[PDB]
Amino acid sequence: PNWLINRYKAMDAAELLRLYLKYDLLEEAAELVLEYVDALLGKGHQYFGIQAPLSATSQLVWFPYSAIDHLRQALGENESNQHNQAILSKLQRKMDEYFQKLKKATDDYKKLVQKPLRA
């Protein structure tokens, strides 16, 4: 019933992803992860208890790698399932966009932290 969900998703912005991939809710799990990545890119961060995107240097960013690897395994165990493969390919393309932007932001943070040991 949407009230509960909305309220356990900016107070505890993940562990539910786990309640989801346990109660066999693969579809909705991939959805939550995508939503969270979207938040992290500065888009809708207020609906994910996130303070910053490409701003105020780099602080903390928890990446739910184990839940994403379970999603990759579950999408690979369905094989024939065309719908799950279409979702998996969309998710992979989005993860690659994220890792490319993360690499750029990390390289720019490394340049920012190198200015100044000239005080």
Binding site: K22, Y23, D24, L25
Partner: protein, 183 residues
């Protein structure tokens, strides 16, 4: 004759029977000689379970009070003991005792979930378990040889009681794929 003696005794048997378990890595394992619960001890346990079953069958207050007790945790202990090995009569009495606990509606919902997790009945084969590895092997190897079927009957009684309180519902995502199909 106290609740402390009954549930401590069950716990001791549960601890003793589990330690006699042989590690998979270890090759050739010998128990310090399985203290096969003596026949007298067995008769005593059976009599205790029968008495418990009679009390909980007639008294709803007693049934709820015994199941909610924090130290005895009877449902956990009993289900734990069922995963151990004993001669079929004791198993039958344990099932009867569970049946007596099940005459009360919500306990039933939690019990279905617990039964699915404990894989007393092997729902989904694990590590090529195939035949046996559960009540099916006991039925074919142990009860069929003894030409007596107490365990099968008790199991049917349990299922029958559970179906009455619900054909329950989704009995386990992630594992199988729903359904009361296997049973």
């Amino acid at each position: 004759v106290s609740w402390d003696h009954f549930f401590h005794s069950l716990m001791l048997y549960h601890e003793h029977l589990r330690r006699d378990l042989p590690n998979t890595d270890n090759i050739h394992q010998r128990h310090p000689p399985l203290r096969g619960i003596t026949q007298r001890e067995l008769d005593g346990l059976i009599a205790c379970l029968q008495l418990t079953c009679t009390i909980i069958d007639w008294s709803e207050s007693a049934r709820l009070a015994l199941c909610e007790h924090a130290q005895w945790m009877p449902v956990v202990v009993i289900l734990g003991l069922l995963q151990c090995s004993i001669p079929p009569l004791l198993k039958a009495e344990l099932l009867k005792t569970l049946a007596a606990f099940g005459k009360s509606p919500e306990i039933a919902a939690s019990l279905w979930q617990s039964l699915e997790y404990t894989q007393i009945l092997q729902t989904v084969r694990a590590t090529g378990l195939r035949q046996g590895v559960g009540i099916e092997v006991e039925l074919n190897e142990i009860e069929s040889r003894c030409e007596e079927y107490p365990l099968t009957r008790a199991f049917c009684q349990l299922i029958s009681t559970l179906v009455e309180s619900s054909f329950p519902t989704n009995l386990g995502a992630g594992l199988r794929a729903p359904g009361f199909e296997p049973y």
